């Protein structure tokens with residue numbers, strides 16, 4: 001559900 | 011005396027901060043420019059979105075944060091982001107100007123600027139009183155970094171699952187901070203408690219900011235000025 005966050009968290 | 015492991019936590023936290031806080035503020039010129047209707051919303055939205063990315067980078071270098079589940083990492087970040095930003099912003103705050111000075115005069119933000127972005131004095135009054143009192147604490151860099159890390163690793167946030175692990179992370183950081191102040195901060199007998207108090211103020215600042223964010227986000231003419239990262243991190247979705 002948290003797309004950008006998941007990406008930013010590698 | 012401080013242990014080898016305690017000082018390692020300190021080192022890796024200081025390093026993490028120096029990697030994610032650019033005292034030159036030369037990245038700010040990339041934001042949508044300030045306008046001084048909500049004229050400051052575009053620039054400050056970009057300021058906040060930029061800062062979230064830095065906070066995620068700091069978090070990823072806190073010992074143990076990366077070993078949490080992604081859900082807890084997200085939960086900890088969605089609840090604590092605005093607090094870490096208020097904390098880290100003390101580094102640009104100035105008692106002289108009672109404002110945040112980030113290099114040039116176009117990147118100096120006083121209270122009136124922040125109202126032109128949709129926030130009221132019921133947020134800005136306690137915030138600026140928080141910034142001056144925290145600035146007065148004259149924190150060492152080691153202490154500033156420990157407080158940000160402690161604030162982030164708080165188990166009493168909506169959504170965290172592995173409460174026990176996060177509380178233990180936070181306990182270790184507190185022991186490091188208590189020891190550090192004791193050994194290395196002369197005249198700091200009451201400093202630890204004053205810092206723990208600031209964590210309590212941060213929660214009240216958080217709530218007020220969330221309140222005012224909602225009225226911004228429920229007005230599409232305003233919410234459209236936000237960034238995708240801001241809308242996601244401050245949005246009310248759950249994983």
Ligand SMILES: C=C1/C(=C\C=C2/CCC[C@@]3(C)[C@H]2CC[C@]3(C)C#CC#CC(C)(C)O)C[C@@H](O)C[C@@H]1O
Nearest residue numbers: 055058061095096098099100101102110119124223
């Ligand atoms: C941010 C940082 C800095 C300044 C912090 C400031 C000054 C501008 C207004 C801000 C941002 C405030 C922190 C909280 C507040 C009052 C807010 C807000 C909001 C909002 C929305 C509209 C998104 O709801 C400068 C440097 O020290 C880097 C640091 O990272």
